[PDB]
Amino acid sequence: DECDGAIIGTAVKGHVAVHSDLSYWIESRYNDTWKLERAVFGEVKSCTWPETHTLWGDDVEESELIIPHTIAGPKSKHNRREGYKTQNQGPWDENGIVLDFDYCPGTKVTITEDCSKRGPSVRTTTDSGKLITDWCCRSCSLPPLRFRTENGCWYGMEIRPVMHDETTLVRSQVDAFK
Amino acid sequence: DECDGAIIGTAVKGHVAVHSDLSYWIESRYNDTWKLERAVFGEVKSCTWPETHTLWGDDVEESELIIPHTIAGPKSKHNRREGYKTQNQGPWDENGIVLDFDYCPGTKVTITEDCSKRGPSVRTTTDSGKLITDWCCRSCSLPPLRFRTENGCWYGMEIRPVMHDETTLVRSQVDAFK
């Protein structure tokens, strides 16, 4: 069950590339390497993005694909960022999501092996609304992988909160690999 | 110069409607009335949304159209919210914008005629990064018209900041009617 290809536009012109359809707009850009810049989502859908409308699809590790292939993430090397594996436990259950690489307001991220492994995405505001200001990751690149939803700012799976008192965490309840 | 219609999908099914193309996803919804809910933008473009792909286009005041018609805002009564006129001075010069109706984090809006008229959109963080916490509007509906861009949270033209000390304001430098 491929996503319908009649309604897909994919283009690269020099050093910007877009994979787009009626709900997704996925931009990658070349600085020194090619990398995923930002992605905008009307609504998340479960289908497979057709190879006919996929740039740079030779020899693709699906684990490297930031937007999971099960939710119409293109099976493209444009869909990558150094230091991040597929974000299957992002906050995908929301609507109107933006994915980019930038700090959540008020937060700070440190690259250090004194950090827990990948988990579900965590929102930057506690269950009662307090800001979690410090974050870490084992080997993720900066600036950090960011999701914005209507209700909050969330980090990629790699990036874990740093807490020193008892805190309730809001975490993505969904998995794109079910 | 109409936007290309080959690449447009517009549908309404019961009480949800979407106007969509390769960069825009515009959702309206019926609760008691029909109103614009949210809109997601890969990139802003200057063209006219064709009537062939426009619901509820009989007898339309272009001043009521939240997304200006000059930037491919559909000329549709779905593209409306009570208490708001067209947002021609929104922060349209950014990329990956989301428009919805919700409070900017940490802010509060009061409906009162002790308030200045419509102006350019104002970001909620001052030029040096301080949060402007209080806002007002003459006759706008709540929850308030919100833009989110990469860099900040912005309010609709109707909604003005409330300040009691000297402050530098970041304001949209663009006009969709040039």
Side-chain angles (χ1 to χ4, degrees):
Chain A
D1 60 331
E2 297 200 308
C3 318
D4 182 12
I7 54 119
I8 302 186
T10 295
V12 54
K13 174 193 257 158
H15 50 75
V16 181
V18 183
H19 287 83
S20 70
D21 69 12
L22 291 174
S23 43
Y24 288 14
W25 157 280
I26 300 168
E27 181 182 27
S28 63
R29 153 185 307 277
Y30 184 86
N31 254 263
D32 304 304
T33 55
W34 277 102
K35 58 191 78 101
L36 184 66
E37 201 189 349
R38 87 179 101 257
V40 192
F41 304 85
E43 53 168 31
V44 178
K45 42 168 204 297
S46 285
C47 54
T48 296
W49 189 283
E51 291 279 5
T52 50
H53 297 66
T54 306
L55 301 169
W56 205 10
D58 60 306
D59 200 28
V60 170
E61 302 204 338
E62 295 195 328
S63 61
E64 296 187 320
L65 297 178
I66 302 303
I67 299 157
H69 73 103
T70 48
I71 56 158
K75 302 191 270 165
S76 167
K77 288 172 167 143
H78 292 283
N79 185 11
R80 307 187 301 175
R81 195 90 178 195
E82 214 252 359
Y84 295 94
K85 301 199 271 184
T86 182
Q87 303 292 304
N88 63 299
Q89 307 189 306
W92 296 115
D93 52 348
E94 312 271 12
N95 208 84
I97 296 159
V98 186
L99 196 178
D100 56 20
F101 300 85
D102 198 13
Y103 295 91
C104 284
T107 68
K108 165 190 201 311
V109 192
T110 299
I111 311 177
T112 160
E113 299 271 347
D114 289 319
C115 192
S116 38
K117 295 168 105 89
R118 274 157 54 92
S121 276
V122 176
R123 192 183 76 187
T124 61
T125 32
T126 62
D127 184 53
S128 84
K130 295 174 187 275
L131 188 47
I132 295 152
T133 70
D134 280 42
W135 300 70
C136 70
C137 57
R138 287 184 179 185
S139 57
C140 83
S141 65
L142 299 173
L145 201 164
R146 185 173 78 164
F147 299 88
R148 296 176 287 168
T149 64
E150 214 199 345
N151 55 280
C153 195
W154 307 66
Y155 272 134
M157 297 180 62
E158 283 69 5
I159 295 159
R160 315 310 304 164
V162 167
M163 301 169 283
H164 320 278
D165 208 352
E166 297 169 47
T167 319
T168 311
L169 291 179
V170 181
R171 311 190 312 152
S172 157
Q173 297 293 295
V174 298
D175 196 323
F177 301 135
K178 285 182 225 280
Chain B
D1 60 331
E2 297 200 308
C3 318
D4 182 12
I7 54 119
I8 302 186
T10 295
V12 54
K13 174 193 257 158
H15 50 75
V16 181
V18 183
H19 287 83
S20 70
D21 69 12
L22 291 174
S23 43
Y24 288 14
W25 157 280
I26 300 168
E27 181 182 27
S28 63
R29 153 185 307 277
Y30 184 86
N31 254 263
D32 304 304
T33 55
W34 277 102
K35 58 191 78 101
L36 184 66
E37 201 189 349
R38 87 179 101 257
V40 192
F41 304 85
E43 53 168 31
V44 178
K45 42 168 204 297
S46 285
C47 54
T48 296
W49 189 283
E51 291 279 5
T52 50
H53 297 66
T54 306
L55 301 169
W56 205 10
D58 60 306
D59 200 28
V60 170
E61 302 204 338
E62 295 195 328
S63 61
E64 296 187 320
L65 297 178
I66 302 303
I67 299 157
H69 73 103
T70 48
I71 56 158
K75 302 191 270 165
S76 167
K77 288 172 167 143
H78 292 283
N79 185 11
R80 307 187 301 175
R81 195 90 178 195
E82 214 252 359
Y84 295 94
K85 301 199 271 184
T86 182
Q87 303 292 304
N88 63 299
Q89 307 189 306
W92 296 115
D93 52 348
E94 312 271 12
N95 208 84
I97 296 159
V98 186
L99 196 178
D100 56 20
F101 300 85
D102 198 13
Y103 295 91
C104 284
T107 68
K108 165 190 201 311
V109 192
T110 299
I111 311 177
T112 160
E113 299 271 347
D114 289 319
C115 192
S116 38
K117 295 168 105 89
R118 274 157 54 92
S121 276
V122 176
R123 192 183 76 187
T124 61
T125 32
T126 62
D127 184 53
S128 84
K130 295 174 187 275
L131 188 47
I132 295 152
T133 70
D134 280 42
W135 300 70
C136 70
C137 57
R138 287 184 179 185
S139 57
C140 83
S141 65
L142 299 173
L145 201 164
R146 185 173 78 164
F147 299 88
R148 296 176 287 168
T149 64
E150 214 199 345
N151 55 280
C153 195
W154 307 66
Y155 272 134
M157 297 180 62
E158 283 69 5
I159 295 159
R160 315 310 304 164
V162 167
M163 301 169 283
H164 320 278
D165 208 352
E166 297 169 47
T167 319
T168 311
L169 291 179
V170 181
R171 311 190 312 152
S172 157
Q173 297 293 295
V174 298
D175 196 323
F177 301 135
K178 285 182 225 280

